[PDB]
Amino acid sequence: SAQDGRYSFICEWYDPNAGLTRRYQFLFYPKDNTIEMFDLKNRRMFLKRSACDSVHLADLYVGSTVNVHSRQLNLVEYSDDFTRRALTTVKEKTLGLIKPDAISKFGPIFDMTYEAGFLVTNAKMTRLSRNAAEEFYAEHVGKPFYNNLVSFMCSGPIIALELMANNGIGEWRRLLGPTDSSTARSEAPNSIRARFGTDNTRNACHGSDSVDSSNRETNFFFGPSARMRNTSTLDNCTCCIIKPTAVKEGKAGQIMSAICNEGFEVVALEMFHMEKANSEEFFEVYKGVVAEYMDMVTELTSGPCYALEIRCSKSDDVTKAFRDFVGPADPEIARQLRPRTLRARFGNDKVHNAVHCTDLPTDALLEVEYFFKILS
Amino acid sequence: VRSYNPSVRVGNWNEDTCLEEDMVKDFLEKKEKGELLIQKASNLRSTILKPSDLSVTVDGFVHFGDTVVIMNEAAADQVRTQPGVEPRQANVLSVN
Amino acid sequence: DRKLHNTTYRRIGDVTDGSFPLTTTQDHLEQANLKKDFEEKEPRKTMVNIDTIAH
Amino acid sequence: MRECISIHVGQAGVQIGNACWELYCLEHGIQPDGQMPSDKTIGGGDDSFNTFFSETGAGKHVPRAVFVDLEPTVVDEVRTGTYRQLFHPEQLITGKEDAANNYARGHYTIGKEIVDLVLDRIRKLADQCTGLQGFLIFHSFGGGTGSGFASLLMERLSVDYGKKSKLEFAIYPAPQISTAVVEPYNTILTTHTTLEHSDCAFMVDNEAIYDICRRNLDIERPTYTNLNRLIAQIVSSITASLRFDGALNVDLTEFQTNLVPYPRIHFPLATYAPVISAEKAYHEQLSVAEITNACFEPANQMVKCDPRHGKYMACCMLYRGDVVPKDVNAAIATIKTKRTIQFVDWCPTGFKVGINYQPPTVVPGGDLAKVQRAVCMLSNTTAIAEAWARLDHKFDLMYAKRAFVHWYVGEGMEEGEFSEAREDLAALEKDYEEVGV
Amino acid sequence: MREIVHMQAGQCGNQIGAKFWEVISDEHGIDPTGTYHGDSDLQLERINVYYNEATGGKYVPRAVLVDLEPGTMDSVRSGPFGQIFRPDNFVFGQSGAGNNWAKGHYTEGAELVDSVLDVVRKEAESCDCLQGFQLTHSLGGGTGSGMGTLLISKIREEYPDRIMNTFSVVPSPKVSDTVVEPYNATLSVHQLVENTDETYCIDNEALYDICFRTLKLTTPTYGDLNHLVSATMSGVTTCLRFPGQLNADLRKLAVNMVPFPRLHFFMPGFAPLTSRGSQQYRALTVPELTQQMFDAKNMMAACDPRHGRYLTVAAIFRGRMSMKEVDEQMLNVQNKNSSYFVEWIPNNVKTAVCDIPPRGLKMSATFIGNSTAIQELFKRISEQFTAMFRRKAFLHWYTGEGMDEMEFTEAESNMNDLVSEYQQYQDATAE
Ligand SMILES: Nc1nc2c(ncn2[C@@H]2O[C@H](COP(=O)(O)OP(=O)(O)OP(=O)(O)O)[C@@H](O)[C@H]2O)c(=O)[nH]1
Ligand SMILES: Nc1nc2c(ncn2[C@@H]2O[C@H](COP(=O)(O)OP(=O)(O)O)[C@@H](O)[C@H]2O)c(=O)[nH]1
Ligand SMILES: [Mg+2]
């Protein structure tokens, strides 16, 4: 009808020519899942009622990228007081920093977060340093747990997560359980801190205890002032792109757990909100020789993707070993032939397989550089 | 009257295709003999910007055969009494 | 208390909050701070640039 | 070394200078503080800013302009504006009383106490300049500071600097709309006293820019911001040959001794074109032939006078961007074969093109689109004789009844100066009608 | 640095001056004590045009309150915004003017004029540029009519090079409120026409009409009238105090509005003047402003411009606006009402833009007309003057007070000269 819920946000789209970032009003209508767009400055009607099938309610996430009709919008502001007070709840940023004790057991942690229903939006694997403890000088020299925890941050890598669920600060705390991992294992039987971790500060997470302290932690992390660096080291490695469909339907934890369990090693982790142009440059080798170029680009752009760098200690070559571990092209062909591999236990069709791999065993270095040194 | 890109078969597209083909020929021969500007900058960055260790003194005295970095301390008048010209920051002696 | 010389209106007209509308030459000159949206950022990151040439 | 001194006099000139120096700072990469953008180098390799900025010992670029207004109203706003530390404090001079639409108050009494100060500042800037190409005097014919003080300044610059070519940007009164009621008096007196002192008079109007912004830039409510931004684009395209490299460079001296046929005939018409908005340059390509045709249409002219009713003495065609010397020749050939535009019989070769490599700079807030090409057409034509005749008719309509004369008489001007100026412009009309035949 | 000294004469002059010093006090953010309770620097940039700096953050107006009774001087001191004036620019008499021009001009008001000139000379040498003097008085009264024009004459003799403007309240055709009002109008405007650069002639029943039918108010008192007069006075001089796209001070207005030195009688007007309850339902724009300016309804003087012809128009637009609309609609009103304009002055409208609106209104406009149709006012006052002067009516109160009838004959001859001078350009053909 005329009014059926009017979730409106300010969005910005950079016009590739003339250098402008034009400002538009996004007007998502629930109960029919439609989108409307107004043109700020020179009042007009940019998009009608429509029925766009790229934007869904779970996508939104002010601060993200949405591709409606190949215009890569960035949602930037909570316009309207109604939408501000209606999505201050439900959508909450929370930090999910995995401690270096669980540096090898992150796959099951991702599996439980996606089973609980936390839409991760940004993720990295970071080294930190002495001066990079702005996350933890808030609790400044209260006890020697300050020095012990700073040393624990400096020893070993971490995986920074930016999760979200309904009233997310508090369900993240419920998923973690209380602190003091021994006591947490004593009372909570299925929390992350109960399943993994040994004692105090060996707790596998830290949480996002209070609101706007979560915002401070994320702004020290992921954002326009983020000076964090990934743990990419190049050498004999290969790509482990995990597609947005497999990320969305609760399979990323299983995929990364299988990757870690069969062998290999995840050396660099990153989570991308890809664009149309960048997806086309990544899949430009998949031009009119396979004839799913458009669908592959669309499924990359239609959600967040997981970039992983894979090495191995089995020698041979990592590219061919990983290409043998991954199903070849199609889920049906991977199910009938070599069903113990990937892309068969996780597979729908040739477009949304589960994952992507370096087909040529001579360009994995260049693709890893494109992910972890170029587009970063 | 209008002009399209050479990918569209309207005007002088054959000669434009031959021209860009010869530019590709020149790029391949220059890459074969290794005198590209991008290679010339990339290997410069890869070789010169490589970290090196420094010899540690056990008594604070400089010894023969030590590595040593010769550096200049920053100016002690970082106030910008003359706006626009930057005061002398920390300098390190290096080779051009 | 009948004071026939009182104004009966403190100000003529009432559609304001007291602020001043930031005069036209000032609005002209403050547009120099609007170069962030006129910046020529390139969201067309090419697959090869100068660190991958050796590879 | 290719120096150029800008003198912005009048309340019109100060605002045109505001837009002009915003455009110059953007084009040469200069912050409102006057530094390089976030520094990162000083270098000294760059020299394109030397024509408009003075490279001091501090690495702080200051403009080579002089802001003059008799009233301290807009110069004070420039002082407490964003370009506060960019301008030198003594560089922005002003008085206490204003000339008040009175050419007598501009040229006499009130004007004859700041003329020494402005000549002193221009002398200091000329001693700064090594290789001064000339002067760019931005004023308005409308009256007061822009007429009387401009006439005094041009007279005492001509008798002090030799030739030293002077380029006057004039805000003409529009045929239908205008502001003052003594404006025909002021315009006629200032053009009579500047005819023998101006090397070239870049003529622009107000109703023409209003119609251009309504018709092509598509703003139903344009203003002096847009007007001054367009004039800034015109003068930037004119001086781009001095500043940046190009295939053909057309300097100032180039422009005078290629454009004007006779010393009295020095009133051309400007037309800068790409003329299009940001949401309409998106869909249409802007080729050299079509932008030259857009210049030669009788609707993009910056003065409200039809060039279809007069002949073209000369044309200067300044291109910016990626204009190729083949399609410029194609466009000029098409213009020459088009019979609607008539050229005079004694000038068979009547074009002077110059191609500059630098593309136009889009201002953060202006309505001009980011365009890779530009053409500025400066045509010496006979179509402004109609404007002169209309101005003299408006003059005679009041001067028959001797209205608004006692102000000038009491402020110092003799009563015969009005008649002498009328004689001079009647001579100018006769000169134009005997040249264009 | 241009400065204007304000001089208040009489009952009505003191009251409208107090309202003026209220409206340009809360335009500049000045509290009743005298400090600066403002927010922007534009208020304090050019406060020296109407204010003198004092000890601390105080600001004393450069206004001289003159009246020949303790009276309204005391009431202005007691009322609000009455502690802002210096208690030395408060010269008052002890006797009464008696609504008598002779009493104001020659008897006891004359011996206080020396102290008034002492005060004005002190405040004038306290200036730096001194653009000029403005005076508010009450033509038809006794203090502002005679002693006010004595002030006009002596100050014009003292400084015959600075802009001297007077606003003045002319008598109304309907009602009287003074029997000797035609006398105190005639031989006071006779003095006013000789030595004033521009006069504004704000009538009173027109103020009643504007208050009653543009603002309603049922009973409008005197504060609404003083408010309209004060708004007009502020809108005339706004360009001296605030920056704008196209400034126009008092000398710009005089040059662009006075063709001949004896034709400086003006038609003041203000826009918008819509009522308090009806202002929320109209889009306040340039077309509405221009039409509510140029209708004959909104004239703040009692003269109807339809019976005459406009010589010159001045439009001062206060507020941020795009003035292409302003220029094109000045064109439009000139072309639509070209019958009501002289044909021998092409472009007989003067446009000014000052992009700071008054507090309250988001955009406003002040109208100053030099229409020929002012001769009806002088003709009516001459008719009422010769009604009494042929029969020696109330002349003894002037002659025994000490004067002659030849001055009255000179005054009526000068008013008939003004009437003939306006009537010639009423229908002076061009060609
Ligand atoms: N194009 C353009 N013209 C302007 C601008 N400002 C004023 N003008 C012109 O200037 C005329 C008004 O006279 P001014 O030039 O302001 O007079 P002045 O130079 O200040 O000298 P005085 O009259 O003594 O104050 C108007 O008719 C306008 O056409 C502007 O910003 N852009
Ligand atoms: N606009 C206005 N007019 C007034 C006011 N008070 C008195 N008048 C007019 O002034 C006239 C009387 O002149 P007056 O000022 O008393 O002369 P004075 O006695 O010499 O001061 C009357 O016709 C009134 O209409 C006022 O507050 N506002
Ligand atoms: Mg001016």
From TrEMBL, chain A:
* Keywords on record: ATP-binding, Cell projection, Cytoplasm, Cytoskeleton, Hydrolase, Kinase, Nucleotide-binding, Transferase
**What SUPFAM superfamilies does the record point to?**
Nucleoside diphosphate kinase, NDK
Q: Name one Pfam family in it.
A: PH_NDK7_N
* Active-site residues from the entry: H206, H356
The cross-references to CDD domains, in alphabetical order and at most eight, read: NDPk7A, NDPk7B
* Compartments it resides in: Cytoplasm, Cytoskeleton, Cilium axoneme
InterPro entries for this protein: DM10_dom, DM10_NDK7, NDK-like_dom, NDK-like_dom_sf, NDPK7, NDPk7A, NDPk7B, Nucleoside_diP_kinase
Q: If you read the UniProt record, what top EC class would you report for this enzyme, in one word?
A: transferase
GO cellular component, as recorded:
axonemal microtubule; centrosome
Ranges for domain DM10: 3-91
- Catalysis: reaction(s): a 2'-deoxyribonucleoside 5'-diphosphate + ATP = a 2'-deoxyribonucleoside 5'-triphosphate + ADP
One biological process GO term for this chain? GTP biosynthetic process
Which residues hold ATP? K99, F145, R173, T179, R193, N203
Q: Which Gene Ontology terms cover its molecular function?
A: ATP binding; hydrolase activity; nucleoside diphosphate kinase activity
**Tagged with keyword Hydrolase:** yes
EC number(s) from the headed UniProt entry: 2.7.4.6
The family assignment reads: Belongs to the NDK family.
What is the name attached to this protein's record?
Nucleoside diphosphate kinase
TrEMBL record, chain C:
Taxonomically, which superkingdom?
Answer: Eukaryota
Its name, as the record gives it, is Uncharacterized protein
Species of origin: Strongylocentrotus purpuratus (Purple sea urchin)
UniProtKB/TrEMBL annotation, chain D:
Family matches, as InterPro entries: Alpha_tubulin (IPR002452), Tub_FtsZ_C (IPR008280), Tubulin (IPR000217), Tubulin/FtsZ-like_C (IPR037103), Tubulin/FtsZ_2-layer-sand-dom (IPR018316), Tubulin/FtsZ_GTPase_sf (IPR036525), Tubulin_C (IPR023123), Tubulin_CS (IPR017975)
Gene3D superfamilies assigned to the protein according to its UniProt record, in alphabetical order: Helix hairpin bin, Tubulin/FtsZ, C-terminal domain, Tubulin/FtsZ, GTPase domain
Q: Does the keyword Cell inner membrane apply?
A: no
Please give the catalytic activity noted in the UniProt record: GTP + H2O = GDP + phosphate + H(+)
Which positions fall inside the Tubulin/FtsZ GTPase domain?
Answer: 49-246
User: Mind listing the UniProt keywords for this protein, alphabetically?
Assistant: Cytoplasm, Cytoskeleton, GTP-binding, Hydrolase, Microtubule, Nucleotide-binding
Q: Which GO terms describe its biological process?
A: microtubule cytoskeleton organization; mitotic cell cycle
Per UniProt, subcellular location reads as: Cytoplasm, Cytoskeleton
Location of the Tubulin/FtsZ 2-layer sandwich domain: 248-393
Cofactor(s) needed, names only, are: Mg(2+)
Q: Name one GO molecular function term.
A: structural constituent of cytoskeleton
Look up the domain of life of the source. Answer: Eukaryota
Q: Which family does the record claim for this protein?
A: Belongs to the tubulin family.
Q: How does it assemble?
A: Dimer of alpha and beta chains. A typical microtubule is a hollow water-filled tube with an outer diameter of 25 nm and an inner diameter of 15 nM. Alpha-beta heterodimers associate head-to-tail to form protofilaments running lengthwise along the microtubule wall with the beta-tubulin subunit facing the microtubule plus end conferring a structural polarity. Microtubules usually have 13 protofilaments but different protofilament numbers can be found in some organisms and specialized cells.
Instruction: Please state what the protein is called.
Output: Tubulin alpha chain
**What species is this protein from?**
Strongylocentrotus purpuratus (Purple sea urchin)
Automatic annotation (TrEMBL), chain E:
Top-rank taxon: Eukaryota
In its UniProt entry, what is this protein called? Answer: Tubulin beta chain
Main localisation, per the record?
Answer: cytoplasm
Question: Any idea where this protein resides?
Answer: Cytoplasm, Cytoskeleton
Name all Tubulin/FtsZ GTPase domain ranges: 47-244
Tell me which family the UniProt entry assigns to this protein.
Answer: Belongs to the tubulin family.
Keywords from the UniProt entry: Cytoplasm, Cytoskeleton, GTP-binding, Magnesium, Metal-binding, Microtubule, Nucleotide-binding
The residue ranges of the Tubulin/FtsZ 2-layer sandwich domain are: 246-383
Role of this protein: Tubulin is the major constituent of microtubules, a cylinder consisting of laterally associated linear protofilaments composed of alpha- and beta-tubulin heterodimers. Microtubules grow by the addition of GTP-tubulin dimers to the microtubule end, where a stabilizing cap forms. Below the cap, tubulin dimers are in GDP-bound state, owing to GTPase activity of alpha-tubulin.
The subunit field of the Swiss-Prot or TrEMBL record says: Dimer of alpha and beta chains. A typical microtubule is a hollow water-filled tube with an outer diameter of 25 nm and an inner diameter of 15 nM. Alpha-beta heterodimers associate head-to-tail to form protofilaments running lengthwise along the microtubule wall with the beta-tubulin subunit facing the microtubule plus end conferring a structural polarity. Microtubules usually have 13 protofilaments but different protofilament numbers can be found in some organisms and specialized cells.
Give the protein's cofactors.
Mg(2+)
The UniProt entry's GO biological process terms, in alphabetical order, are: microtubule-based process
The Gene Ontology CC terms held by the record are: microtubule
- Gene3D superfamilies registered for this protein in UniProt: Helix hairpin bin, Tubulin/FtsZ, C-terminal domain, Tubulin/FtsZ, GTPase domain
